Amino acid sequence: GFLSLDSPTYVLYRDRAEWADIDPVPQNDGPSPVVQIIYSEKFRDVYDYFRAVLQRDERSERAFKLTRDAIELNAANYTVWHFRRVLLRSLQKDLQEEMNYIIAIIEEQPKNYQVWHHRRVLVEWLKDPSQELEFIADILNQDAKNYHAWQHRQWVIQEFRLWDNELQYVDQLLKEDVRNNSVWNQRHFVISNTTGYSDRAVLEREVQYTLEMIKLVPHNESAWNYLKGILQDRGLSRYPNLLNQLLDLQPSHSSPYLIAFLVDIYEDMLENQCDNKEDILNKALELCEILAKEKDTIRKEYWRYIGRSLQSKHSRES
Amino acid sequence: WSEPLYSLRPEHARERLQDDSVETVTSIEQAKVEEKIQEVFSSYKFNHLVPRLVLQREKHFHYLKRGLRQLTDAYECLDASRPWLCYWILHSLELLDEPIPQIVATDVCQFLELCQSPDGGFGGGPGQYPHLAPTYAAVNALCIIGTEEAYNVINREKLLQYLYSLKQPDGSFLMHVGGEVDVRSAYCAASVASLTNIITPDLFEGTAEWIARCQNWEGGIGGVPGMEAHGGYTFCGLAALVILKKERSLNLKSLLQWVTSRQMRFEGGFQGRCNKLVDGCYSFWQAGLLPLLHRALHAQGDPALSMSHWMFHQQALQEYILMCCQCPAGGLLDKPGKSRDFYHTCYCLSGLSIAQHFGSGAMLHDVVMGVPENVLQPTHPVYNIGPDKVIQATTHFLQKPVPGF
Ligand SMILES: CCCCCCNC(=O)Oc1ccc(C[C@@H]2CN(Cc3cncn3C)c3ccc(C#N)cc3CN2S(=O)(=O)c2ccc(OC)cc2)cc1
Ligand SMILES: CC(C)=CCC/C(C)=C/CC/C(C)=C/COP(=O)(O)OP(=O)(O)O
Ligand SMILES: [Zn+2]
C-alpha cells in the first residue's frame, strides 16, 4: 500500500487526490530567517503535509504512512517519531510488523539515536527480547564498535536477565579483533554483573588471559587498561609477583604501557609504605623522565606532573 | 638546523604505529590515517618550501557569515537541530573576534522565540516539540548575543517546569518527554539551569551520584552506567559535576590518566575512545577536560600543578588543527579527506583556543603556534561560550529569584 520515496513514479503529496481535503502548512521561519535550509522540493512537500496532520492531530492510516516518509527524509526528527508512536497506539497497529520496519531502518542508519530508542519502546510494549541479541549481533558484524548497538545490548541483557551466553560472544569478538575496546568493556560488564572479580578462580583467569593477550600484542593499549582496571581498586601492591613478572616481559615486550604500569605499581607500593622507599621512588622517577623525555613525549606534561606529585610526598622529608 | 614544529622533527617518525605484526581491523584503520597525516606533515619538504602555519580567518569568516543566513540541502539531516546551528556558527564567530550585527542578533532572537515551547524549553525548529539538546544550544546562543532582548526571550518559569518534567527518581534526566536518559541530558539541564538562575534545592538531587555511576573501569565516563568511556560523555559528566560543585564524586586520578592517554602520539589530535581514530572535534571534548581537572585538583590543594601549561601537548594539538583540520575554502573538519561542517568548525576552533590559553588564578600564559595572528578569543571550559559572556549572563539572572521565591 506504499509508494516509495525513490520510486520512479513517486508523486508529490500536493499532486495526490487522497490528500485534496487537507491544506499543507508551510514552515513559519519569520520575515527574515536565520539558518534557513534550502530544502529539496520532495522534503518541503512531505514536511508541509506532516505539519498539517500534526496540527489537526489526525490519527489516520494516511498520517501513519506519511510519518514513514518524513522519517526517511530526516530520521533525527524526534517530533515525527513521537507522533508515529501515538499513531501505533491509536490505530492499534500490529507491533511485529513495526518491529520488521525498525529492523530495516536500523540496518540502513545504524548511528542514529531515534531509531534505537524506538526499537526499545517496541520491545518494552511487546515484553519480547527474543529477536534482540541476534539482531544486534548483525549490526555489530558490520561495525563492531557501534555505540548505540552496544548500549541497546546492555539494556536488553540487564532488563530481561540474559547473561548466560554473553561471555562466549565476547570471546568470539575478542578473537576477531583483540584491540576492540568495546568488547573489553563488554567483558567487564558481563563479569562484574555475574560472578564478579572479587574471586580467585575467576580473577586469576582474567589476569592470566590478559597477560597472555599483552604478550601476543604488547602495544595493544586495551588489554593494558583492562589489566589495570581489574586490579587497581584493590591496590596493585597487594599482588607482589606482578612487578617481577612485568619486568620479565620488558626486554622482549617493552612499550610505554609496560613502563607506565611499572610506575603505577611503584606508586601503590609507596602509598602503602613498602620496604625501601628511596629505592622504589628513584626507580619511578627514572621511568617518569624516560617517558617524558624519550618514550612518551606527547604526555610530557602529565609525566612531569606524576614525577612531581611523587617527589612531593615520598621523598626524605619531615 | 632545529625544527620548530614538533610534528616535522626527525624523531617524530618513531611515534608511528607498532602493530607487533598482528593485523586487525583497528590497526589497519589506524595505519591508513597515519599514512595520510604523514603526507600532510611531509608536504613542505617534498615541495621544497618553508612551513608557515596560518589560520585562514577570512575564509572561515565568509563561510560562517553565509551559513548564519542560508544552508544547502545537505543540512536537511539537521532540520531538527537549528538552534545547534545558531550556537556552532555564533560561537565560531565569537572565537574569531567577529562582532554580530544588531540586525542579525535580533533575527536570531526572533527565530529562537519561534522554537520555544509554551510549556518550556526549545525545540529543533518552529513548531517542533521541546528537547534538552536544542534547549542548551538556544540558551547558549542567546547568552553569546548577550543583549537584554536575548535574555528576555527565555521563559524561566516554564523552563524550570520543563526540567522537572524530565527529572527521574534515580537522579537522571530524560532528553525529552517520552525519550530516554543520557549523561548529556544532565549537562544540558545543569548548564541551562545554572546560567539562568533557576536551580532549586531538590532539582539535582541524585544527579551527581547518577553521573558517578557512569565512570567505569577505564577512568572515563560512558553515556549510561556500564557503557564504554567516551570523550563527549566524559566532557558532559565532569562539566555537569563542576557546575554542581560535586567534582569529588569522581575518581579524578583515573579520569586524568584516561583523557591524557587519548592524545594521539603521532597525529597530535585526540581520539574519542581508546583504540579509535583521531578526530578534530575531540580537540574540544577531550582537551577541554584539562582545564576542568586543573581547577578541580587545584581546589583540593594539589601543589604539583603547572602554573604555565595544561596537562596535554598544547603545541601538537595546534599543529594537528592548523595543518590537518582546515578546509582551504573555509571551515574546519574531522580529519583530512573529510568534508567541512559547522560542527567541526565550532569545536576545532574551541579546541585551538583551549590549547592557546592557560589560566590558573593570577597565572596566565599563551602558546601560539604559527603566525601571531592565529590567536583566538578565550572560551569558558564549562559552557563553551566566551568567559565574559558567562559572567555577564550569570550576573543578569542573579538579579531575579529562583522561581518562585
Ligand atoms: C537542536 C536540536 C538537536 C536535537 C538533538 C541533537 N543531538 C544532541 O544534542 O546530542 C548530540 C549527540 C551527538 C552529537 C554529535 C554528532 C556528531 N556528528 C557526526 C560526527 C562528528 N564527528 C565525527 N562524526 C561522524 C556531526 C557531524 C556534523 C555535524 C554538522 N554540521 C554535526 C554533527 C552533530 N551530531 S549529529 O548526531 O546530530 C550528526 C551525525 C551525523 C551527521 O551526518 C554528517 C550529521 C549530524 C551532537 C549532539
Ligand atoms: C551537549 C551535548 C549533547 C554534547 C554531545 C556529546 C557527544 C559528542 C556525544 C557523542 C555520542 C556518540 C554515540 C558517539 C560515538 O560516535 P562515533 O562512533 O561515530 O565516533 P568515535 O568512533 O570517534 O567515538
Ligand atoms: Zn568529529
JSON list of C-alpha atoms in Angstrom, two decimals, chain B residues 5-192:
[
{"chain": "B", "resi": 5, "resn": "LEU", "atom": "CA", "xyz": [57.34, 22.16, 14.50]},
{"chain": "B", "resi": 6, "resn": "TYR", "atom": "CA", "xyz": [57.13, 19.07, 16.76]},
{"chain": "B", "resi": 7, "resn": "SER", "atom": "CA", "xyz": [55.37, 17.03, 14.05]},
{"chain": "B", "resi": 8, "resn": "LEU", "atom": "CA", "xyz": [58.11, 17.69, 11.46]},
{"chain": "B", "resi": 9, "resn": "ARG", "atom": "CA", "xyz": [61.11, 16.68, 13.59]},
{"chain": "B", "resi": 10, "resn": "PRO", "atom": "CA", "xyz": [63.10, 13.57, 12.52]},
{"chain": "B", "resi": 11, "resn": "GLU", "atom": "CA", "xyz": [62.33, 11.92, 15.90]},
{"chain": "B", "resi": 12, "resn": "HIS", "atom": "CA", "xyz": [58.60, 12.09, 15.21]},
{"chain": "B", "resi": 13, "resn": "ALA", "atom": "CA", "xyz": [58.86, 9.17, 12.75]},
{"chain": "B", "resi": 14, "resn": "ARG", "atom": "CA", "xyz": [59.37, 6.89, 15.76]},
{"chain": "B", "resi": 15, "resn": "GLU", "atom": "CA", "xyz": [55.82, 7.64, 17.00]},
{"chain": "B", "resi": 16, "resn": "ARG", "atom": "CA", "xyz": [54.27, 5.61, 14.14]},
{"chain": "B", "resi": 17, "resn": "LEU", "atom": "CA", "xyz": [52.05, 2.65, 15.00]},
{"chain": "B", "resi": 18, "resn": "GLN", "atom": "CA", "xyz": [53.75, -0.56, 16.12]},
{"chain": "B", "resi": 19, "resn": "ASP", "atom": "CA", "xyz": [51.35, -3.34, 15.15]},
{"chain": "B", "resi": 20, "resn": "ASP", "atom": "CA", "xyz": [53.55, -6.18, 16.53]},
{"chain": "B", "resi": 21, "resn": "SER", "atom": "CA", "xyz": [52.94, -7.99, 13.23]},
{"chain": "B", "resi": 22, "resn": "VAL", "atom": "CA", "xyz": [49.36, -8.67, 14.39]},
{"chain": "B", "resi": 23, "resn": "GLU", "atom": "CA", "xyz": [46.91, -7.02, 11.97]},
{"chain": "B", "resi": 24, "resn": "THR", "atom": "CA", "xyz": [43.30, -6.40, 12.99]},
{"chain": "B", "resi": 25, "resn": "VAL", "atom": "CA", "xyz": [40.60, -4.06, 11.57]},
{"chain": "B", "resi": 26, "resn": "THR", "atom": "CA", "xyz": [41.58, -1.45, 14.16]},
{"chain": "B", "resi": 27, "resn": "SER", "atom": "CA", "xyz": [45.31, -1.47, 13.32]},
{"chain": "B", "resi": 28, "resn": "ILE", "atom": "CA", "xyz": [44.71, -1.41, 9.56]},
{"chain": "B", "resi": 29, "resn": "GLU", "atom": "CA", "xyz": [42.43, 1.62, 10.02]},
{"chain": "B", "resi": 30, "resn": "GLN", "atom": "CA", "xyz": [44.90, 3.44, 12.29]},
{"chain": "B", "resi": 31, "resn": "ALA", "atom": "CA", "xyz": [47.78, 2.88, 9.81]},
{"chain": "B", "resi": 32, "resn": "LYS", "atom": "CA", "xyz": [45.76, 4.38, 6.94]},
{"chain": "B", "resi": 33, "resn": "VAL", "atom": "CA", "xyz": [45.15, 7.62, 8.90]},
{"chain": "B", "resi": 34, "resn": "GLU", "atom": "CA", "xyz": [48.84, 7.85, 9.91]},
{"chain": "B", "resi": 35, "resn": "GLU", "atom": "CA", "xyz": [49.88, 7.34, 6.30]},
{"chain": "B", "resi": 36, "resn": "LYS", "atom": "CA", "xyz": [47.60, 10.26, 5.28]},
{"chain": "B", "resi": 37, "resn": "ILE", "atom": "CA", "xyz": [48.70, 12.54, 8.10]},
{"chain": "B", "resi": 38, "resn": "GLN", "atom": "CA", "xyz": [52.37, 11.84, 7.36]},
{"chain": "B", "resi": 39, "resn": "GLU", "atom": "CA", "xyz": [51.79, 13.08, 3.75]},
{"chain": "B", "resi": 40, "resn": "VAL", "atom": "CA", "xyz": [50.43, 16.33, 5.19]},
{"chain": "B", "resi": 41, "resn": "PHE", "atom": "CA", "xyz": [53.38, 16.75, 7.57]},
{"chain": "B", "resi": 42, "resn": "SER", "atom": "CA", "xyz": [55.87, 15.87, 4.80]},
{"chain": "B", "resi": 43, "resn": "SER", "atom": "CA", "xyz": [54.43, 18.07, 2.04]},
{"chain": "B", "resi": 44, "resn": "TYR", "atom": "CA", "xyz": [56.69, 21.06, 2.91]},
{"chain": "B", "resi": 45, "resn": "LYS", "atom": "CA", "xyz": [59.90, 19.01, 2.42]},
{"chain": "B", "resi": 46, "resn": "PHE", "atom": "CA", "xyz": [58.68, 17.36, -0.78]},
{"chain": "B", "resi": 47, "resn": "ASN", "atom": "CA", "xyz": [57.63, 20.72, -2.27]},
{"chain": "B", "resi": 48, "resn": "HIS", "atom": "CA", "xyz": [60.84, 22.45, -1.01]},
{"chain": "B", "resi": 49, "resn": "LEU", "atom": "CA", "xyz": [59.14, 25.27, 0.91]},
{"chain": "B", "resi": 50, "resn": "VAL", "atom": "CA", "xyz": [59.48, 26.64, 4.45]},
{"chain": "B", "resi": 51, "resn": "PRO", "atom": "CA", "xyz": [56.46, 25.72, 6.66]},
{"chain": "B", "resi": 52, "resn": "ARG", "atom": "CA", "xyz": [54.21, 28.51, 7.90]},
{"chain": "B", "resi": 53, "resn": "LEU", "atom": "CA", "xyz": [51.01, 27.76, 9.81]},
{"chain": "B", "resi": 54, "resn": "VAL", "atom": "CA", "xyz": [48.21, 30.26, 9.27]},
{"chain": "B", "resi": 55, "resn": "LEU", "atom": "CA", "xyz": [44.64, 30.11, 10.46]},
{"chain": "B", "resi": 56, "resn": "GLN", "atom": "CA", "xyz": [42.60, 31.16, 7.37]},
{"chain": "B", "resi": 57, "resn": "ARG", "atom": "CA", "xyz": [40.46, 33.62, 9.30]},
{"chain": "B", "resi": 58, "resn": "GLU", "atom": "CA", "xyz": [38.95, 35.39, 6.31]},
{"chain": "B", "resi": 59, "resn": "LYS", "atom": "CA", "xyz": [37.92, 32.17, 4.56]},
{"chain": "B", "resi": 60, "resn": "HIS", "atom": "CA", "xyz": [36.36, 30.83, 7.83]},
{"chain": "B", "resi": 61, "resn": "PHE", "atom": "CA", "xyz": [34.54, 34.15, 8.39]},
{"chain": "B", "resi": 62, "resn": "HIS", "atom": "CA", "xyz": [32.89, 34.13, 4.91]},
{"chain": "B", "resi": 63, "resn": "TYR", "atom": "CA", "xyz": [31.80, 30.51, 5.35]},
{"chain": "B", "resi": 64, "resn": "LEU", "atom": "CA", "xyz": [30.17, 31.32, 8.69]},
{"chain": "B", "resi": 65, "resn": "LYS", "atom": "CA", "xyz": [28.62, 34.72, 7.75]},
{"chain": "B", "resi": 66, "resn": "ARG", "atom": "CA", "xyz": [26.77, 32.97, 4.94]},
{"chain": "B", "resi": 67, "resn": "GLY", "atom": "CA", "xyz": [25.71, 29.85, 6.88]},
{"chain": "B", "resi": 68, "resn": "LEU", "atom": "CA", "xyz": [24.18, 32.02, 9.59]},
{"chain": "B", "resi": 69, "resn": "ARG", "atom": "CA", "xyz": [21.63, 33.01, 6.95]},
{"chain": "B", "resi": 70, "resn": "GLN", "atom": "CA", "xyz": [21.32, 30.18, 4.49]},
{"chain": "B", "resi": 71, "resn": "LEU", "atom": "CA", "xyz": [22.21, 26.48, 4.30]},
{"chain": "B", "resi": 72, "resn": "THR", "atom": "CA", "xyz": [22.21, 23.96, 1.41]},
{"chain": "B", "resi": 73, "resn": "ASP", "atom": "CA", "xyz": [20.02, 20.82, 1.47]},
{"chain": "B", "resi": 74, "resn": "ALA", "atom": "CA", "xyz": [22.98, 18.87, 2.83]},
{"chain": "B", "resi": 75, "resn": "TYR", "atom": "CA", "xyz": [21.70, 20.25, 6.16]},
{"chain": "B", "resi": 76, "resn": "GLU", "atom": "CA", "xyz": [18.25, 18.56, 5.79]},
{"chain": "B", "resi": 77, "resn": "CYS", "atom": "CA", "xyz": [19.57, 16.00, 8.33]},
{"chain": "B", "resi": 78, "resn": "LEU", "atom": "CA", "xyz": [19.92, 18.88, 10.81]},
{"chain": "B", "resi": 79, "resn": "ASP", "atom": "CA", "xyz": [16.40, 20.30, 10.29]},
{"chain": "B", "resi": 80, "resn": "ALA", "atom": "CA", "xyz": [15.56, 19.21, 13.89]},
{"chain": "B", "resi": 81, "resn": "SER", "atom": "CA", "xyz": [18.77, 20.90, 15.18]},
{"chain": "B", "resi": 82, "resn": "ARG", "atom": "CA", "xyz": [18.52, 24.52, 14.01]},
{"chain": "B", "resi": 83, "resn": "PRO", "atom": "CA", "xyz": [19.30, 26.07, 17.39]},
{"chain": "B", "resi": 84, "resn": "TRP", "atom": "CA", "xyz": [22.54, 23.99, 17.35]},
{"chain": "B", "resi": 85, "resn": "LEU", "atom": "CA", "xyz": [23.50, 25.59, 14.05]},
{"chain": "B", "resi": 86, "resn": "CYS", "atom": "CA", "xyz": [22.91, 29.03, 15.61]},
{"chain": "B", "resi": 87, "resn": "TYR", "atom": "CA", "xyz": [25.21, 28.11, 18.52]},
{"chain": "B", "resi": 88, "resn": "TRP", "atom": "CA", "xyz": [28.01, 26.48, 16.46]},
{"chain": "B", "resi": 89, "resn": "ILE", "atom": "CA", "xyz": [28.13, 29.40, 13.99]},
{"chain": "B", "resi": 90, "resn": "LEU", "atom": "CA", "xyz": [27.79, 32.24, 16.54]},
{"chain": "B", "resi": 91, "resn": "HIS", "atom": "CA", "xyz": [30.44, 30.66, 18.82]},
{"chain": "B", "resi": 92, "resn": "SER", "atom": "CA", "xyz": [32.89, 30.27, 15.91]},
{"chain": "B", "resi": 93, "resn": "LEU", "atom": "CA", "xyz": [32.43, 33.99, 15.05]},
{"chain": "B", "resi": 94, "resn": "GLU", "atom": "CA", "xyz": [32.93, 34.97, 18.71]},
{"chain": "B", "resi": 95, "resn": "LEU", "atom": "CA", "xyz": [36.18, 32.92, 18.81]},
{"chain": "B", "resi": 96, "resn": "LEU", "atom": "CA", "xyz": [37.37, 34.69, 15.59]},
{"chain": "B", "resi": 97, "resn": "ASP", "atom": "CA", "xyz": [36.65, 38.09, 17.18]},
{"chain": "B", "resi": 98, "resn": "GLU", "atom": "CA", "xyz": [33.97, 38.97, 14.64]},
{"chain": "B", "resi": 99, "resn": "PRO", "atom": "CA", "xyz": [31.13, 41.13, 16.00]},
{"chain": "B", "resi": 100, "resn": "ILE", "atom": "CA", "xyz": [27.47, 40.26, 15.42]},
{"chain": "B", "resi": 101, "resn": "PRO", "atom": "CA", "xyz": [25.43, 42.96, 13.67]},
{"chain": "B", "resi": 102, "resn": "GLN", "atom": "CA", "xyz": [22.49, 44.16, 15.89]},
{"chain": "B", "resi": 103, "resn": "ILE", "atom": "CA", "xyz": [20.46, 43.19, 12.86]},
{"chain": "B", "resi": 104, "resn": "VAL", "atom": "CA", "xyz": [21.42, 39.50, 12.88]},
{"chain": "B", "resi": 105, "resn": "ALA", "atom": "CA", "xyz": [21.38, 39.44, 16.68]},
{"chain": "B", "resi": 106, "resn": "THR", "atom": "CA", "xyz": [17.70, 40.42, 16.66]},
{"chain": "B", "resi": 107, "resn": "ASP", "atom": "CA", "xyz": [16.92, 37.97, 13.83]},
{"chain": "B", "resi": 108, "resn": "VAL", "atom": "CA", "xyz": [18.47, 35.08, 15.83]},
{"chain": "B", "resi": 109, "resn": "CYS", "atom": "CA", "xyz": [16.45, 36.15, 18.88]},
{"chain": "B", "resi": 110, "resn": "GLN", "atom": "CA", "xyz": [13.16, 36.13, 16.96]},
{"chain": "B", "resi": 111, "resn": "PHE", "atom": "CA", "xyz": [13.97, 32.78, 15.37]},
{"chain": "B", "resi": 112, "resn": "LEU", "atom": "CA", "xyz": [14.74, 31.19, 18.76]},
{"chain": "B", "resi": 113, "resn": "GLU", "atom": "CA", "xyz": [11.49, 32.64, 20.11]},
{"chain": "B", "resi": 114, "resn": "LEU", "atom": "CA", "xyz": [9.69, 30.65, 17.44]},
{"chain": "B", "resi": 115, "resn": "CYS", "atom": "CA", "xyz": [11.46, 27.49, 18.59]},
{"chain": "B", "resi": 116, "resn": "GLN", "atom": "CA", "xyz": [10.44, 27.98, 22.21]},
{"chain": "B", "resi": 117, "resn": "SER", "atom": "CA", "xyz": [7.64, 25.73, 23.51]},
{"chain": "B", "resi": 118, "resn": "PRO", "atom": "CA", "xyz": [4.72, 27.18, 25.58]},
{"chain": "B", "resi": 119, "resn": "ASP", "atom": "CA", "xyz": [5.29, 24.53, 28.23]},
{"chain": "B", "resi": 120, "resn": "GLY", "atom": "CA", "xyz": [9.06, 25.36, 28.38]},
{"chain": "B", "resi": 121, "resn": "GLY", "atom": "CA", "xyz": [12.31, 24.53, 26.61]},
{"chain": "B", "resi": 122, "resn": "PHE", "atom": "CA", "xyz": [13.21, 24.92, 22.93]},
{"chain": "B", "resi": 123, "resn": "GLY", "atom": "CA", "xyz": [12.63, 22.52, 20.06]},
{"chain": "B", "resi": 124, "resn": "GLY", "atom": "CA", "xyz": [14.74, 21.80, 16.96]},
{"chain": "B", "resi": 125, "resn": "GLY", "atom": "CA", "xyz": [12.80, 24.30, 14.82]},
{"chain": "B", "resi": 126, "resn": "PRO", "atom": "CA", "xyz": [9.48, 26.23, 14.77]},
{"chain": "B", "resi": 127, "resn": "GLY", "atom": "CA", "xyz": [6.60, 24.05, 15.92]},
{"chain": "B", "resi": 128, "resn": "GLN", "atom": "CA", "xyz": [8.83, 21.14, 16.96]},
{"chain": "B", "resi": 129, "resn": "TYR", "atom": "CA", "xyz": [8.46, 19.62, 20.42]},
{"chain": "B", "resi": 130, "resn": "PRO", "atom": "CA", "xyz": [11.00, 20.72, 23.09]},
{"chain": "B", "resi": 131, "resn": "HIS", "atom": "CA", "xyz": [14.19, 18.73, 23.72]},
{"chain": "B", "resi": 132, "resn": "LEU", "atom": "CA", "xyz": [17.14, 19.37, 26.15]},
{"chain": "B", "resi": 133, "resn": "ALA", "atom": "CA", "xyz": [19.75, 19.47, 23.35]},
{"chain": "B", "resi": 134, "resn": "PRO", "atom": "CA", "xyz": [18.24, 22.39, 21.36]},
{"chain": "B", "resi": 135, "resn": "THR", "atom": "CA", "xyz": [17.35, 24.00, 24.76]},
{"chain": "B", "resi": 136, "resn": "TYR", "atom": "CA", "xyz": [21.05, 24.09, 25.65]},
{"chain": "B", "resi": 137, "resn": "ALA", "atom": "CA", "xyz": [22.07, 25.46, 22.20]},
{"chain": "B", "resi": 138, "resn": "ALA", "atom": "CA", "xyz": [19.35, 28.11, 22.24]},
{"chain": "B", "resi": 139, "resn": "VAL", "atom": "CA", "xyz": [20.30, 29.35, 25.78]},
{"chain": "B", "resi": 140, "resn": "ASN", "atom": "CA", "xyz": [23.98, 29.35, 24.82]},
{"chain": "B", "resi": 141, "resn": "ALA", "atom": "CA", "xyz": [23.36, 31.24, 21.58]},
{"chain": "B", "resi": 142, "resn": "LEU", "atom": "CA", "xyz": [21.22, 33.82, 23.41]},
{"chain": "B", "resi": 143, "resn": "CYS", "atom": "CA", "xyz": [24.00, 34.32, 26.01]},
{"chain": "B", "resi": 144, "resn": "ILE", "atom": "CA", "xyz": [26.61, 34.78, 23.24]},
{"chain": "B", "resi": 145, "resn": "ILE", "atom": "CA", "xyz": [24.43, 37.62, 21.85]},
{"chain": "B", "resi": 146, "resn": "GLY", "atom": "CA", "xyz": [24.15, 38.86, 25.42]},
{"chain": "B", "resi": 147, "resn": "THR", "atom": "CA", "xyz": [21.75, 41.75, 24.97]},
{"chain": "B", "resi": 148, "resn": "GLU", "atom": "CA", "xyz": [18.67, 42.44, 27.11]},
{"chain": "B", "resi": 149, "resn": "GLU", "atom": "CA", "xyz": [16.41, 41.32, 24.23]},
{"chain": "B", "resi": 150, "resn": "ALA", "atom": "CA", "xyz": [18.22, 37.96, 24.10]},
{"chain": "B", "resi": 151, "resn": "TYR", "atom": "CA", "xyz": [17.99, 37.38, 27.86]},
{"chain": "B", "resi": 152, "resn": "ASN", "atom": "CA", "xyz": [14.28, 38.28, 27.74]},
{"chain": "B", "resi": 153, "resn": "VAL", "atom": "CA", "xyz": [13.47, 35.52, 25.15]},
{"chain": "B", "resi": 154, "resn": "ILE", "atom": "CA", "xyz": [13.91, 32.82, 27.82]},
{"chain": "B", "resi": 155, "resn": "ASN", "atom": "CA", "xyz": [10.78, 31.92, 29.89]},
{"chain": "B", "resi": 156, "resn": "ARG", "atom": "CA", "xyz": [12.45, 30.93, 33.14]},
{"chain": "B", "resi": 157, "resn": "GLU", "atom": "CA", "xyz": [9.31, 29.67, 34.92]},
{"chain": "B", "resi": 158, "resn": "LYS", "atom": "CA", "xyz": [8.35, 27.33, 32.09]},
{"chain": "B", "resi": 159, "resn": "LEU", "atom": "CA", "xyz": [11.98, 26.24, 31.66]},
{"chain": "B", "resi": 160, "resn": "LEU", "atom": "CA", "xyz": [12.07, 25.06, 35.30]},
{"chain": "B", "resi": 161, "resn": "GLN", "atom": "CA", "xyz": [8.76, 23.21, 34.91]},
{"chain": "B", "resi": 162, "resn": "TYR", "atom": "CA", "xyz": [10.13, 21.54, 31.79]},
{"chain": "B", "resi": 163, "resn": "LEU", "atom": "CA", "xyz": [13.31, 20.42, 33.66]},
{"chain": "B", "resi": 164, "resn": "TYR", "atom": "CA", "xyz": [11.19, 18.90, 36.48]},
{"chain": "B", "resi": 165, "resn": "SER", "atom": "CA", "xyz": [9.09, 17.03, 33.88]},
{"chain": "B", "resi": 166, "resn": "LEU", "atom": "CA", "xyz": [12.27, 15.31, 32.71]},
{"chain": "B", "resi": 167, "resn": "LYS", "atom": "CA", "xyz": [13.86, 14.52, 36.11]},
{"chain": "B", "resi": 168, "resn": "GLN", "atom": "CA", "xyz": [13.81, 10.80, 37.11]},
{"chain": "B", "resi": 169, "resn": "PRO", "atom": "CA", "xyz": [13.95, 9.16, 40.63]},
{"chain": "B", "resi": 170, "resn": "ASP", "atom": "CA", "xyz": [17.48, 7.68, 40.14]},
{"chain": "B", "resi": 171, "resn": "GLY", "atom": "CA", "xyz": [18.99, 11.20, 39.64]},
{"chain": "B", "resi": 172, "resn": "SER", "atom": "CA", "xyz": [18.88, 11.15, 35.80]},
{"chain": "B", "resi": 173, "resn": "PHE", "atom": "CA", "xyz": [17.02, 13.36, 33.22]},
{"chain": "B", "resi": 174, "resn": "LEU", "atom": "CA", "xyz": [15.21, 12.31, 30.08]},
{"chain": "B", "resi": 175, "resn": "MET", "atom": "CA", "xyz": [16.32, 14.17, 26.89]},
{"chain": "B", "resi": 176, "resn": "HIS", "atom": "CA", "xyz": [12.68, 14.92, 26.12]},
{"chain": "B", "resi": 177, "resn": "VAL", "atom": "CA", "xyz": [9.23, 13.69, 27.22]},
{"chain": "B", "resi": 178, "resn": "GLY", "atom": "CA", "xyz": [8.95, 10.06, 26.06]},
{"chain": "B", "resi": 179, "resn": "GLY", "atom": "CA", "xyz": [12.74, 9.97, 25.37]},
{"chain": "B", "resi": 180, "resn": "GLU", "atom": "CA", "xyz": [15.48, 8.29, 27.44]},
{"chain": "B", "resi": 181, "resn": "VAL", "atom": "CA", "xyz": [18.34, 9.32, 29.73]},
{"chain": "B", "resi": 182, "resn": "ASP", "atom": "CA", "xyz": [21.87, 10.22, 28.95]},
{"chain": "B", "resi": 183, "resn": "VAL", "atom": "CA", "xyz": [24.83, 11.86, 30.71]},
{"chain": "B", "resi": 184, "resn": "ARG", "atom": "CA", "xyz": [24.37, 14.63, 28.10]},
{"chain": "B", "resi": 185, "resn": "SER", "atom": "CA", "xyz": [20.91, 15.43, 29.45]},
{"chain": "B", "resi": 186, "resn": "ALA", "atom": "CA", "xyz": [22.31, 16.12, 32.95]},
{"chain": "B", "resi": 187, "resn": "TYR", "atom": "CA", "xyz": [24.87, 18.56, 31.47]},
{"chain": "B", "resi": 188, "resn": "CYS", "atom": "CA", "xyz": [22.23, 20.30, 29.31]},
{"chain": "B", "resi": 189, "resn": "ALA", "atom": "CA", "xyz": [19.97, 20.67, 32.39]},
{"chain": "B", "resi": 190, "resn": "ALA", "atom": "CA", "xyz": [22.80, 21.92, 34.69]},
{"chain": "B", "resi": 191, "resn": "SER", "atom": "CA", "xyz": [24.17, 24.31, 32.01]},
{"chain": "B", "resi": 192, "resn": "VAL", "atom": "CA", "xyz": [20.85, 25.95, 31.30]}
]
